[PDB]
Amino acid sequence: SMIAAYQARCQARVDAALDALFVAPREELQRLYEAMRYSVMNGGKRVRPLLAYAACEALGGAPQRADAAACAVELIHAYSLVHDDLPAMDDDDLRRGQPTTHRAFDEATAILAADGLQALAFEVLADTRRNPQEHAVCLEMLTRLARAAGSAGMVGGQAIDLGSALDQAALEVMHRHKTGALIEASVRLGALASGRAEPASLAALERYAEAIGLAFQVQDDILDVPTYPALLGLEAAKGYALELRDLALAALDGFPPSADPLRQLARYIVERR
Amino acid sequence: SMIAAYQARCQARVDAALDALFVAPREELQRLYEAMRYSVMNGGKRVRPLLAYAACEALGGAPQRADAAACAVELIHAYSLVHDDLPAMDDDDLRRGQPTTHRAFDEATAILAADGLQALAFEVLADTRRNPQEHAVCLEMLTRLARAAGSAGMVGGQAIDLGSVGVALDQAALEVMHRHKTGALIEASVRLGALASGRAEPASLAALERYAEAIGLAFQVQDDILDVPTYPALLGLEAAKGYALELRDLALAALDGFPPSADPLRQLARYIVE
Numbered sequence A: 001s002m003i004a005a006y007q008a009r010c011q012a013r014v015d016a017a018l019d020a021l022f023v024a025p026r027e028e029l030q031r032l033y034e035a036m037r038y039s040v041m042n043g044g045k046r047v048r049p050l051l052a053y054a055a056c057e058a059l060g061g062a063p064q065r066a067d068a069a070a071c072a073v074e075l076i077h078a079y080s081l082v083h084d085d086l087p088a089m090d091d092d093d094l095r096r097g098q099p100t101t102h103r104a105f106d107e108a109t110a111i112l113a114a115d116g117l118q119a120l121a122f123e124v125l126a127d128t129r130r131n132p133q134e135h136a137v138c139l140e141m142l143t144r145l146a147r148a149a150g151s152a153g154m155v156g157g158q159a160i161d162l163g164s165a166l167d168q169a170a171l172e173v174m175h176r177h178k179t180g181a182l183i184e185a186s187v188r189l190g191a192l193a194s195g196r197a198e199p200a201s202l203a204a205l206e207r208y209a210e211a212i213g214l215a216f217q218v219q220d221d222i223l224d225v226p227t228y229p230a231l232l233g234l235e236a237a238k239g240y241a242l243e244l245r246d247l248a249l250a251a252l253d254g255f256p257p258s259a260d261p262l263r264q265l266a267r268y269i270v271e272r273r
Numbered sequence B: 001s002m003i004a005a006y007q008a009r010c011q012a013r014v015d016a017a018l019d020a021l022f023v024a025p026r027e028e029l030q031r032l033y034e035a036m037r038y039s040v041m042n043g044g045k046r047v048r049p050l051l052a053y054a055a056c057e058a059l060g061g062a063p064q065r066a067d068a069a070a071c072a073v074e075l076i077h078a079y080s081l082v083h084d085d086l087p088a089m090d091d092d093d094l095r096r097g098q099p100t101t102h103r104a105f106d107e108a109t110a111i112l113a114a115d116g117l118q119a120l121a122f123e124v125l126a127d128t129r130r131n132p133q134e135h136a137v138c139l140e141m142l143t144r145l146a147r148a149a150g151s152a153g154m155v156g157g158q159a160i161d162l163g164s165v166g167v168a169l170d171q172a173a174l175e176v177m178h179r180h181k182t183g184a185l186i187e188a189s190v191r192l193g194a195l196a197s198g199r200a201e202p203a204s205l206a207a208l209e210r211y212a213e214a215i216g217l218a219f220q221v222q223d224d225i226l227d228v229p230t231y232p233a234l235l236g237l238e239a240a241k242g243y244a245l246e247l248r249d250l251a252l253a254a255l256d257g258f259p260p261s262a263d264p265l266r267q268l269a270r271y272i273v274e
C-alpha cells in the first residue's frame, strides 16, 4: 500500500527531467517553449513514467536507467492530449479544471507545441547521453515507441474511436489501441532500459500491461456509473475488473519482490474510488 | 537535363518505398491509412529525398543506402504541410488544384494522419531492416531528424512565423525564420543522406552543411522572385536576383574538393536559381 509514495517519487523524478527540456534555445522561440511546458507541466499523475520505472525495477535495473523512457512516454502522452482537446477533436476548454493549451495560447500554437513534443520524445530516446543504453537497445526502444505512438497504435486508436452500437470485442479493440499500445510501450521501454530484458520476461510484462490497461478502462466506466457496465451489467463489469487484475498478477508470477510496485499498481487500479 | 533525370529517378524510387508504408494493418484503420496515403502520394517533387540520395552519392555511397533517410525526410515534410493547411494555421483548401487532406477527409482525420506520419518517419529510421546502417549511425540520423523537425527547427520556424504577424521583419529576421522553417529540414536531408553513405567524416559533413545552408535560402529567394515581407520587397527585384546568384556561388564553393559523384548537388544548386 505504498503505491502512492512510489507514484510520488516517480512523478518528482520525471517532472524534474521533463522540466529541463523546455528551455528555448533562442528568444524568438520562447512562446513556443512556454506552450510546450504548459502542455506537459500540468500536475499529471505520470502513470506512464511510473510504469517505465517499475518495469525497469521488476527486472532488476536501477530506475534511473529508465529516465529517458519515462520522459519519452510522457511526452507522447502529453502531445496526444493537446491534440485531443482541439476543437476538431474533443473540443475541450478545460483539462482537469485548467484552460487547454489552445485557450491559454492559441490553436496554431497548440497544434505546433504538441507536434514539437512528439519530435522531442524521439529526440530524447535517440540521444545517447540522455538515454545511455547499448545502441541496439536504444533502437528497439525507438522502434517500439514509434509503432506504439503511431497509426498502428495510439493514433490508430484515436481514429478507431472517432470512427465508431459497438460490441465488447470492438470496444476492446479501441481501448487496446487508444490507450493500451502506449501503456504496453511504457512497460516495454522500462524493461529494455533494465539491461536484463529477455523474451519470456518481456512477454510476461506485456501480458501484465494488456491486463492493466484494460482494467483501468473497466474501472473507470464503473466509477462513472456504450460502456463496460452497459455491456456486461454493473456487477459483472466489477467481476471482470477483478479478473483483469488477476491476469496482471498471474503474469508476474515468478518475478522477484522488486516487481511489487507493478503488483500494487494492478490492485490500486481496481480498488480506486 | 542531367538534374531533371536525377530528380525523376529519386522521385520514382522514394515513391515506391513510401507507397508501401500505407497499408492499414486492420480494417478499422483503413480510412486513417487512406488519409496518410493521400497526404504523401500527391505527385510532389521530392526535393528532400533528392538531397538525401545526392548527398549519399557525393560521399561515394550507393544511393539505395539512403532510401530510409529519403522516406523519413519526406514523411516529415508531408506531415508538416498537412498541419499547416488546417483552418487554424494557413487554412488552405487546395494544394496544386487538389483538396488538402482536411478538405478531402475531415479536420480530425487530417490532424491524426499527419501525427501518424511524424511517428512513422522515426519508425523508418529506427528499423534496422529498412535503414540498415551501423547502429550508432542510425541513432545519429534519428537525432538529427528529431532536432531538425522539432521545436528548435521546423516547428520552431512555424512558431516564429506566427509570432511575426504585423511586425515588419528586416532581412535578418526573415532569414532567421526561413532557416528554422525550411532550412533545418533541408540541412537534415543532406546530413542524413551523407550519414547513409557509410563514408561520412566531420570535414565532409561540415562542407555539405554549408552547401545545404546556401541552397535552402536560395530556394526561398528564388521562390519570391518567381512569384514576381519578401526578398524582392526588401531588396528590390534586381538585388534579390543578385543574392540568389551569390547563394548559388556559396553552394558551389562548399563543394570544393568533392569528386564527380557530387555533380548532382552542383547541378541542383544551379537549377534552383534557373
Ligand SMILES: O=C(O)Cc1noc2ccccc12
Pocket: A003, A004, A005, A007, A045, A047, A268
Ligand atoms: O494510492 C493512492 O493513494 C494514489 C495513487 N497511488 O498510486 C497511484 C498511481 C497513479 C495515480 C494515483 C495513485
Ligand SMILES: O=C(O)Cc1noc2ccccc12
Pocket: A045, A046, A047, A183, A212, A213, A216, A269
Ligand atoms: O493518468 C492516466 O492517464 C490515467 C490512469 N490513471 O491510472 C491508470 C492506470 C492505467 C492506465 C491509465 C491510468
Ligand SMILES: [Mg+2]
Pocket: A217, A220, A221, A227
Ligand atoms: Mg469508458
Ligand SMILES: [Mg+2]
Pocket: B084, B085, B090, B092
Ligand atoms: Mg498554404
Ligand SMILES: [Mg+2]
Pocket: B220, B223, B224, B230, B231
Ligand atoms: Mg517567400
